[PDB]
Scaffold this active site. Structure first.
Site, PDB file in Angstrom:
ATOM      1  N   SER A 100     -10.046 -19.524  12.747  1.00 50.71           N
ATOM      2  CA  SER A 100     -10.426 -20.915  12.426  1.00 50.71           C
ATOM      3  C   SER A 100     -11.848 -21.238  12.879  1.00 50.71           C
ATOM      4  O   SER A 100     -12.315 -22.333  12.504  1.00 50.71           O
ATOM      5  CB  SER A 100      -9.501 -21.884  13.105  1.00 50.71           C
ATOM      6  OG  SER A 100      -8.182 -21.765  12.585  1.00 50.71           O
ATOM      7  N   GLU A 126      -5.500 -16.181   4.272  1.00 48.86           N
ATOM      8  CA  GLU A 126      -5.702 -14.712   4.228  1.00 48.86           C
ATOM      9  C   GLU A 126      -6.771 -14.273   5.225  1.00 48.86           C
ATOM     10  O   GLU A 126      -6.704 -13.118   5.660  1.00 48.86           O
ATOM     11  CB  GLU A 126      -6.084 -14.254   2.826  1.00 48.86           C
ATOM     12  CG  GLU A 126      -4.933 -14.386   1.872  1.00 48.86           C
ATOM     13  CD  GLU A 126      -4.958 -15.600   0.958  1.00 48.86           C
ATOM     14  OE1 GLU A 126      -5.604 -16.662   1.309  1.00 48.86           O
ATOM     15  OE2 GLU A 126      -4.360 -15.468  -0.147  1.00 48.86           O
TER      16      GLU A 126
HETATM   17  O1  LIG Z   1      -4.771 -21.289  10.933  1.00 53.97           O
HETATM   18  C1  LIG Z   1      -4.469 -21.501  12.167  1.00 53.97           C
HETATM   19  C2  LIG Z   1      -4.999 -22.590  13.048  1.00 53.97           C
HETATM   20  C3  LIG Z   1      -4.680 -22.838  14.436  1.00 53.97           C
HETATM   21  C4  LIG Z   1      -5.311 -23.846  15.348  1.00 53.97           C
HETATM   22  P1  LIG Z   1      -6.945 -22.796  15.961  1.00 53.97           P
HETATM   23  O2  LIG Z   1      -7.134 -21.580  15.021  1.00 53.97           O
HETATM   24  O3  LIG Z   1      -6.662 -22.311  17.357  1.00 53.97           O
HETATM   25  O4  LIG Z   1      -8.132 -23.705  15.838  1.00 53.97           O
HETATM   26  C5  LIG Z   1      -3.748 -21.857  15.051  1.00 53.97           C
HETATM   27  C6  LIG Z   1      -3.434 -22.027  16.446  1.00 53.97           C
HETATM   28  C7  LIG Z   1      -2.490 -21.185  17.132  1.00 53.97           C
HETATM   29  C8  LIG Z   1      -1.982 -20.195  16.277  1.00 53.97           C
HETATM   30 BR1  LIG Z   1      -0.699 -18.778  16.999  1.00 53.97          BR
HETATM   31  C9  LIG Z   1      -2.280 -19.919  14.954  1.00 53.97           C
HETATM   32  C10 LIG Z   1      -3.177 -20.766  14.252  1.00 53.97           C
HETATM   33  N1  LIG Z   1      -3.492 -20.512  12.824  1.00 53.97           N
HETATM   34  C11 LIG Z   1      -2.867 -19.324  11.974  1.00 53.97           C
HETATM   35  C12 LIG Z   1      -1.359 -19.719  11.547  1.00 53.97           C
HETATM   36  C13 LIG Z   1      -0.413 -18.814  10.568  1.00 53.97           C
HETATM   37  C14 LIG Z   1       0.414 -19.848   9.692  1.00 53.97           C
HETATM   38  C15 LIG Z   1       0.098 -21.262  10.396  1.00 53.97           C
HETATM   39  C16 LIG Z   1      -1.311 -21.164  10.863  1.00 53.97           C
END
Ligand code: A1A20
EC number: 3.5.2.6
Length: 269
Positions: free
Chosen positions: A47, A145
């Site tokens: 992110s 992705e």
């Molecule tokens: O896209 C994100 C965004 C966040 C918040 P940041 O990246 O820390 O800003 C995030 C947080 C904890 C975690 Br474990 C995973 C995250 N994912 C991938 C996921 C796979 C399906 C749902 C989203």
């Protein structure tokens, strides 16, 4: 310059306890002193590209009056997992400014993809980063992705040093016009997702803006920040991690500890 050695052995021990790789670049904008640990290696952005995405939108707003106030409407199909602001405005739509704030401060995935579409996609954001002199950054894919974090894959990566250099240019340098620069800083300062990362290493009386990233595989997570210690010039830093096994867990505690060691290296304890 050679502050790296005050803390190069502490970083090796932290990364050994973590069981993966930690990449750190920290710069004292006052003296130009730097701390580097694997600062030239590629790490998945996860992110963390959403902060640069908001900066690219603000840059475009210098050439396109009214861009920030543009209403954007989207369907249920635009929502992807972790869209905590955009899901509340599905029936109404949101402005470009609101989507930018959601992408930065809540890491909103639908908002990120909607803003990527406005910039011409991943190549469009990569073009913006080239325009400010960043030759390392590459975005290749969309949410979700870009979170694959495959070992050895350069797609959707940058280096801690290139992320720090670009963050300095956008927040403290002349890459954005003054109003846009302060809006970018204000979004980073209002981030809600980073309390257990760099922020956890900084005293409560210092101002901090950050953007997190968490891929959810290969122990891959990161944070970058601008920190305004009282009575001295700001510090810009990037902390990135990855690990060899898909099942490996990220650690927010390791990112905080890495940030503490980078500040101790710069003499800002
Ligand atoms: O896209 C994100 C965004 C966040 C918040 P940041 O990246 O820390 O800003 C995030 C947080 C904890 C975690 Br474990 C995973 C995250 N994912 C991938 C996921 C796979 C399906 C749902 C989203």
């Amino acid at each position: 310059h050679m502050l790296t050695n005050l803390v190069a052995e502490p970083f090796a021990k932290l990364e050994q306890d973590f069981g993966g790789s930690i990449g750190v670049y920290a710069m004292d904008t006052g003296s130009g002193a730097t701390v580097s640990y694997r600062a030239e290696e590629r790490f998945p952005l996860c992110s963390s590209f959403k902060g640069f995405l908001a900066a690219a939108v603000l840059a475009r707003s210098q050439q396109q009056a009214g861009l920030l106030d543009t209403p954007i409407r989207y369907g249920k199909n635009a929502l992807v997992p972790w869209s905590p602001i955009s899901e509340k405005y599905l029936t109404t739509g949101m402005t470009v400014a609101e989507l930018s704030a959601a992408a930065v401060q809540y890491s909103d995935n639908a908002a990120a993809n909607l803003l990527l579409k406005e910039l011409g996609g991943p190549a469009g954001l990569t073009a913006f980063m080239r325009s400010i002199g960043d030759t390392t950054f590459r975005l290749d894919r969309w949410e979700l992705e870009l979170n694959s974090a495959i070992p050895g894959d350069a797609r959707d990566t940058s280096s801690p040093r290139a992320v720090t250099e670009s963050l300095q240019k956008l927040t403290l340098g002349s890459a954005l016009a003054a109003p846009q620069r302060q809006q970018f800083v204000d979004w980073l300062k209002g981030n809600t997702t980073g309390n257990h990362r760099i922020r956890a290493a900084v005293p409560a009386d210092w101002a901090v803006g950050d953007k997190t990233g968490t891929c959810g595989v290969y122990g891959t997570a990161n944070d970058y920040a601008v920190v305004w210690p009282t009575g001295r010039a700001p510090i810009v830093l990037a902390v990135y991690t990855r690990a060899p096994n898909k099942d490996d867990k990220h650690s927010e505690a390791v990112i905080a500890a890495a940030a503490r060691l980078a500040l101790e290296g710069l003499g800002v304890n």
